[PDB]
Design a protein around this motif. Structure first.
Motif, mmCIF file in Angstrom:
data_model
loop_
_atom_site.group_PDB
_atom_site.id
_atom_site.type_symbol
_atom_site.label_atom_id
_atom_site.label_comp_id
_atom_site.label_asym_id
_atom_site.label_seq_id
_atom_site.Cartn_x
_atom_site.Cartn_y
_atom_site.Cartn_z
ATOM 1 N N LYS B 90 0.855 -1.177 0.000
ATOM 2 C CA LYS B 90 0.000 0.000 0.000
ATOM 3 C C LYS B 90 0.893 1.230 0.000
ATOM 4 C CE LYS B 90 -0.387 0.658 4.969
ATOM 5 N NZ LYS B 90 -1.059 0.155 6.194
ATOM 6 N N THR B 91 0.626 2.157 -0.915
ATOM 7 C CA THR B 91 1.401 3.391 -1.031
ATOM 8 C C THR B 91 0.615 4.490 -0.326
ATOM 9 O OG1 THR B 91 0.472 3.573 -3.258
ATOM 10 C CG2 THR B 91 2.761 2.836 -3.053
ATOM 11 N N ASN B 92 0.881 4.654 0.965
ATOM 12 C CA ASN B 92 0.193 5.634 1.791
ATOM 13 C C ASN B 92 1.099 6.837 2.010
ATOM 14 O OD1 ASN B 92 -2.158 4.199 2.014
ATOM 15 N ND2 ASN B 92 -1.826 3.525 4.130
ATOM 16 N N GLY B 93 0.569 8.026 1.747
ATOM 17 C CA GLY B 93 1.328 9.246 1.913
ATOM 18 C C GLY B 93 2.109 9.616 0.671
ATOM 19 N N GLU B 94 2.779 10.762 0.768
ATOM 20 C CA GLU B 94 3.585 11.298 -0.318
ATOM 21 C C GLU B 94 5.078 11.236 -0.038
ATOM 22 O OE1 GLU B 94 3.663 15.500 -0.630
ATOM 23 O OE2 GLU B 94 5.337 15.301 -2.034
ATOM 24 N N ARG B 98 8.139 9.855 -2.407
ATOM 25 C CA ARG B 98 9.207 10.782 -2.755
ATOM 26 C C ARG B 98 10.570 10.161 -2.487
ATOM 27 N NH1 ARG B 98 4.997 13.254 -5.121
ATOM 28 N NH2 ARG B 98 5.222 15.529 -5.173
ATOM 29 N N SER B 101 11.331 7.126 -4.901
ATOM 30 C CA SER B 101 11.651 7.588 -6.245
ATOM 31 C C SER B 101 12.983 8.328 -6.272
ATOM 32 C CB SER B 101 10.529 8.476 -6.764
ATOM 33 O OG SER B 101 9.371 7.707 -7.031
ATOM 34 N N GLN B 102 13.301 9.062 -5.204
ATOM 35 C CA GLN B 102 14.600 9.717 -5.125
ATOM 36 C C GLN B 102 15.718 8.690 -5.133
ATOM 37 O OE1 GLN B 102 17.148 12.281 -5.565
ATOM 38 N NE2 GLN B 102 15.293 13.328 -4.860
ATOM 39 N N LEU B 104 15.536 5.684 -6.422
ATOM 40 C CA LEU B 104 15.569 5.112 -7.762
ATOM 41 C C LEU B 104 16.363 5.997 -8.714
ATOM 42 C CD1 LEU B 104 13.668 2.986 -6.777
ATOM 43 C CD2 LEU B 104 12.142 3.479 -8.681
ATOM 44 N N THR B 105 16.043 7.291 -8.744
ATOM 45 C CA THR B 105 16.707 8.184 -9.687
ATOM 46 C C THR B 105 18.179 8.351 -9.342
ATOM 47 O OG1 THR B 105 16.676 10.391 -10.672
ATOM 48 C CG2 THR B 105 16.040 10.207 -8.370
ATOM 49 N N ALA B 131 10.643 -2.441 -8.506
ATOM 50 C CA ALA B 131 11.256 -1.430 -9.358
ATOM 51 C C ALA B 131 12.741 -1.274 -9.064
ATOM 52 C CB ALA B 131 10.540 -0.095 -9.182
ATOM 53 N N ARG B 134 15.159 -3.834 -11.108
ATOM 54 C CA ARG B 134 15.357 -3.737 -12.543
ATOM 55 C C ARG B 134 16.834 -3.545 -12.865
ATOM 56 N NH1 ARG B 134 14.417 0.171 -14.446
ATOM 57 N NH2 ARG B 134 13.854 -0.036 -16.652
ATOM 58 N N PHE B 135 17.176 -3.794 -14.123
ATOM 59 C CA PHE B 135 18.561 -3.692 -14.551
ATOM 60 C C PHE B 135 19.050 -2.257 -14.420
ATOM 61 C CE2 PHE B 135 21.954 -2.742 -17.295
ATOM 62 C CZ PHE B 135 21.508 -1.916 -18.306
#
Lengths: 753, 465, 116
Positions: B90-94, B98, B101-102, B104-105, B131, B134-135
């Motif tokens: 479950k993706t609860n909150g922002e 953030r 994803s930070q 990941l990038t 995610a 991934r390669f």
């Protein structure tokens, strides 16, 4: 006639290229003239054309420097055009490379460029690079600007200026920008994308004259790491368009309000630099499927993207290549007309695709001469391109493994000879494959199986029936339309287990060159249990896009048994989520579409009658146990790969082994090979024992007994032969066949007056 | 030595993922490696990052990456990456999105030339967001599993080197008796043993005295019995985790059964001992086999013996465990078992009580109105048909009831070879008898072969009893 | 036109005994509720088709919802002739073949059999 293949040149001069004399005459080019050469990425250069009789007519010879200038390599095709307008340069600005100038004192122009250009009349173009030899050292130089602003011939009177910052080698290496040749496994999707994108951007006049609106939205879905990001860059760089990349994670990582600013700035700049291309990498993060809309920022960004896509115009010359893993994961609102209309499937590469990917990734490595990449491609199934690159890296790592013992780790310096001696070997690739793991195994593979009717044993009646029902409506549909009657859109296979139903389906698919899709009941059952029943509609959709196709529903009775079918699993029938959805999709199929569907069941008395109703799956065909010739065919196919003792002819055994299924045949062969195998290892163990008895006895050149599969081990195997199907099961099957047949009376009693 | 990779023109991996059981020593390995290579090590703890205020966590992470790249060669350990990037259930909150994803990038933006390696860490790979796997981000994965007997021995010797052990300490006995114990549990056991020695040493030392005699302090030292007491009081932390090892059971422990011995050696021993010649002729080997026979006849012993003969790993999975996990809605455990069996190839995946699931659904006795297939069974078939032919992952199924097994499981390609395990015969019963009494002394008047001779129709369990 | 009205009843069981009891469920009960709630003045006629009449829930057959029952027999000589010509109406036939002659004697065969 002006297109030639790049080849190595005898002359190493940077400003001189060689062409075949007759080819030059066809182009009216004379020796010593200045010619404009166009390569990849719309990058061209100017070189001095010389006649070279040793150069092939369709080939053009030029050195590494000009190759770099043209952004092409050996085997690439480049165009040569007359350039009589090259004017003697009044002033040329050329700057050196940062690393190549260390240790050189004074004016680098005087040391290298001044004698390199003085009286040489070497043509130079903006951005061209070359290597100049002088003072025991070779120094790289990049042309910054020319007086004509396009290109010029640097004459002795030309004022060459080298006052500026040095050029960085690492940044210069980016000049080897990606092209179409740096991607593989996507030939068809590559053509679709190249067309849909490059055509309007390079030649919009065609669409304007035809008065059509070129698409703005392109959606590239597929498996992760398949190479999506590379295709877009290749296309943009080949069309010469300005490419701006947006990553979903990068946008979502920005602070509220900043993401929208970045997105709008991206669109605005892209429209400024038309023709332009925008890649919304991993659009799933930006606009994931609306399963739950939590928060306000997510809705703000998704709606901002929607309105931005809508507000864009065809005249803006902008194309938006999205990207994701599965189309359903995207919010449907994005797939409405105007925003994202075209969709492309960058699926798992095929055997040939895997081969090209491997050749692409391994070109820069020091492969051995015994490397057999075809074997690796054949043994790699379900491997995406990224997994293949990882496999190559693992193989190199294993070679290092073998090369560690000699190289001391504590020594900061390592001998150069050992470094030059390193090179991967086929066995290293085998080891890496053994250690690696595929990332795509549950994804429906769409390909043309190689199974042929020869592999199918006899079954002339069923062969004819299925060829009738399938081969014709896909090989000669125009005449079906001529008469116009609706063709059969389905068929059901009922027969004993392990009789080669999937083989029959694949063979009929291959005969028609039609794609085959294998879907097993357990997978749909799991997905429904996973509350992802949309997978069924996805299977139907895929089967539709790749038409012509043969959707093979393996173990159709598995779902009915899970509900009960006829045995009484639950109190009643077999219909459920998956079954009902399958019926709904069946009745909704397009008559004109060449999507034939085949259902295989080992239990026909339990299948829900609603599925057998006409219009969904009505043709019922019985698959009998293999007969004498069929059993012979299965036997030879199973032993086709293996050698057999001359005393053993398998047709004789096949003749008398009635009532035994193909699976039993396979197991008889397995056990026969297995017993011959025990014999082989026992002989080897006895040989080892003898050698232990006489270790010093030199091994004479005694002809090793041929390790074959003899008849005695076939006897030993059949001693454990099985027949899974009894005559009662076949009696049930023929009872069903009789309940189906019910044909009599008017076979010959009917004739007109 | 990056020059080697540069010459071979390969890209050294950036992402390494060390999953395993908690406290197995993950954090120590990374520091050891970094300190031995002389590289700059910067540690990041998931809890520490997540405890910071919004915006500060990203600043700390970016500063970490930036400094690490400055001090190349460098190593980054994202301890307990599960908190930073837990599985998207479950993706609860922002803020959570953030930060994930930070990360990941940041991982994507890093480059091979930067000379940076990111050793993650977690408990189970599935607990991480896909995610990240991934390669490009996290490609290599390593299993820091439970240490083996020898591993337990080295861990004990490492933790007890600084303590005042007695000369009669027998750490080998402790290692043998410690099963399912992770390294941290072994350190806790050592501490408990020292505490028990203190127990024995309290009576002389007065508590109210601020000073204690130095002679008594120098006289303290743990004893083997203290270790036994601590083991009795301690508790293992890993008991339900699939243990992958080479059982010591040999054919000698297997009584007779020459026919079955031959059959199973044929079906398993060869394709793992001489696979190159199988390829030479090339025919597909059998990828399965099913054991049907009376209960308590030594099927697991046979499987372990055949595994040992081939030096192949043996994995014991009982139907109740898969049944519980499905009832726990964690059916991905089945794919996890298959995956593990695959990585540790060569392997012998032994599905104990395959008929337990079918009976839970009914099998042939009619549990429900119909057949036996369900979540776990269907997933097992799907994984079976998806196995790699070239992989040396042989699977063995044991069932005490063959008439109830779903026919779909017996179809060729998944588990087709069927072998019957008879009740032990005269020599087999003699072997079982001697094995059971092998450890114990017997009166000279008693020779067990004589009793074994006439006790036909009695299973090995009856012998043991 | 409610096609395969008996499909829902069979899913619940109808008369064959799918579940232990009858056929009524969510969809069926909602259909009855909407049926009884229809406007008399509205020209919304509803037709139900079933291949199995012995399994249909009796509550659906109660007057006021769907009561008129009409039997559709297998095509007779002229009906079979009509189906034959309709199926071959689009296609050309050899002059030697007149399909009415075949239609005459092919009693007991449904229109689907004619099409096939």
């Amino acid at each position: 006639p002006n297109r030639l293949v790049v080849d190595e040149a005898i002359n190493d001069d940077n400003s001189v290229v060689s062409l075949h004399p007759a080819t030059m005459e066809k182009l009216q080019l004379f020796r010593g003239d200045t010619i404009l050469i166009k390569g990849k990425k719309r990058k061209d250069t100017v070189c001095i054309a010389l006649a070279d009789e040793t150069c092939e007519e369709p080939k053009i010879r030029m050195n590494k420097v000009v190759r770099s200038n043209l952004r092409v390599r050996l085997g690439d095709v480049i165009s040569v055009h007359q350039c009589p307008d090259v004017k003697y340069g009044k002033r040329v600005h050329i700057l050196p490379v940062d690393d190549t100038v260390e240790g050189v004192t004074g004016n680098l122009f005087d040391a290298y460029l001044k004698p390199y250009f003085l009286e040489a009349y070497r043509p130079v173009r903006k951005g061209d690079l070359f290597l100049v030899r002088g003072g025991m050292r070779s120094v790289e130089f990049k042309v910054i600007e020319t007086d004509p602003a396009e290109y010029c011939v640097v004459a002795p009177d030309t004022e060459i200026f080298c006052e500026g910052e040095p050029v960085k080698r690492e940044d210069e290496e980016r000049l080897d920008d990606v092209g179409y040749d740096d991607v593989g496994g996507v030939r068809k999707q590559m053509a679709q994308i190249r067309e849909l994108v490059e055509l309007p951007l390079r030649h919009p006049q065609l669409f304007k004259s035809i008065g059509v609106k070129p698409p703005k939205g392109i959606l590239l879905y597929g498996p992760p790491g398949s190479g999506k990001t590379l295709i877009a860059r290749a296309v943009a760089n080949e069309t010469g368009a300005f490419f701006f990349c947006i990553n979903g994670p990068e946008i979502m990582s920005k602070l509220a309000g900043e993401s929208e600013s970045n997105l709008r700035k991206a669109f605005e700049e892209a429209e400024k630099n038309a023709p332009s291309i925008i890649f919304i990498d991993e659009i799933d993060s930006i606009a994931p499927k609306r399963e739950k809309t939590n928060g306000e920022v997510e809705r703000r960004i998704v709606s901002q993207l929607l309105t931005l896509m809508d507000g864009l115009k065809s005249r803006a010359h902008v194309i938006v290549m999205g990207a994701t893993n599965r189309p359903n994961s995207i919010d449907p609102a994005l797939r409405r007309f105007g925003r994202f209309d075209r969709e492309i499937d960058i699926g798992v590469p095929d055997e040939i695709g895997r081969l090209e990917v491997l050749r692409i990734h391994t070109k820069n490595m020091k492969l051995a001469e015994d490397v057999d990449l075809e074997r690796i491609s054949k043994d790699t199934h379900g491997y995406v391109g990224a997994d293949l690159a990882a496999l190559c890296t693992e193989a190199a790592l294993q070679c290092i493994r073998e090369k560690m013992d000699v190289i001391d780790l504590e020594d900061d310096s390592i001998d150069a000879e050992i470094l030059n001696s390193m090179a991967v070997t086929n066995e290293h690739f085998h080891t890496a494959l053994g250690n690696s793991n595929p990332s795509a195994l549950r994804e429906t593979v769409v390909e043309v199986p190689n199974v042929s009717w020869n592999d199918i044993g006899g079954l002339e009646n069923v062969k004819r029936e299925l060829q009738e029902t399938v081969q014709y409506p896909v090989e000669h549909p125009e005449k079906f339309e001529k008469f116009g009657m609706s063709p059969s859109k389905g068929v059901l296979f009922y027969g004993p287990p392990g009789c080669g139903k999937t083989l029959l389906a694949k063979a009929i698919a291959n005969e028609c060159q039609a794609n085959f899709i294998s879907v097993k009941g357990p997978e749909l059952l799991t997905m429904w249990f996973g509350e992802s029943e949309a997978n069924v509609r996805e299977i139907f959709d895929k089967a539709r896009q790749s038409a012509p196709c043969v959707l093979f529903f393996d173990e159709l009775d598995s779902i009915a048994t899970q509900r009960g079918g006829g045995s009484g699993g639950d109190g009643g029938g077999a219909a459920d989520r998956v079954l009902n959805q399958l019926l709904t999709e069946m009745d909704g199929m397009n008559a004109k579409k060449t999507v034939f569907i085949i259902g295989a069941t080992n239990r026909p008395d339990i299948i829900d009658s609603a599925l057998l109703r006409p219009g969904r799956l009505d043709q019922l065909i019985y698959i009998p146990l293999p007969d004498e010739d069929s059993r012979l065919n299965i036997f030879k196919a199973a032993l086709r790969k293996s050698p057999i003792a001359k005393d053993v002819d398998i047709g004789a055994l096949a003749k008398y082994t009635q009532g035994f299924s193909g699976a039993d045949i396979t197991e008889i062969c397995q056990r026969a090979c297995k017993y011959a195998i025990r014999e082989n290892i026992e002989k080897d163990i006895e040989k080892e024992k003898r050698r232990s008895e006489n270790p010093e006895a030199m091994e004479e050149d005694g002809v090793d007994e041929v390790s074959e599969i003899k008849a005695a081990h076939f006897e030993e195997s059949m001693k454990y032969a099985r027949r899974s199907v009894s005559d009662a099961d076949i009696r049930k099957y023929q009872a069903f066949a009789q309940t189906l047949q019910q044909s009599r009376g008017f076979g010959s009693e009917f004739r007109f007056e």
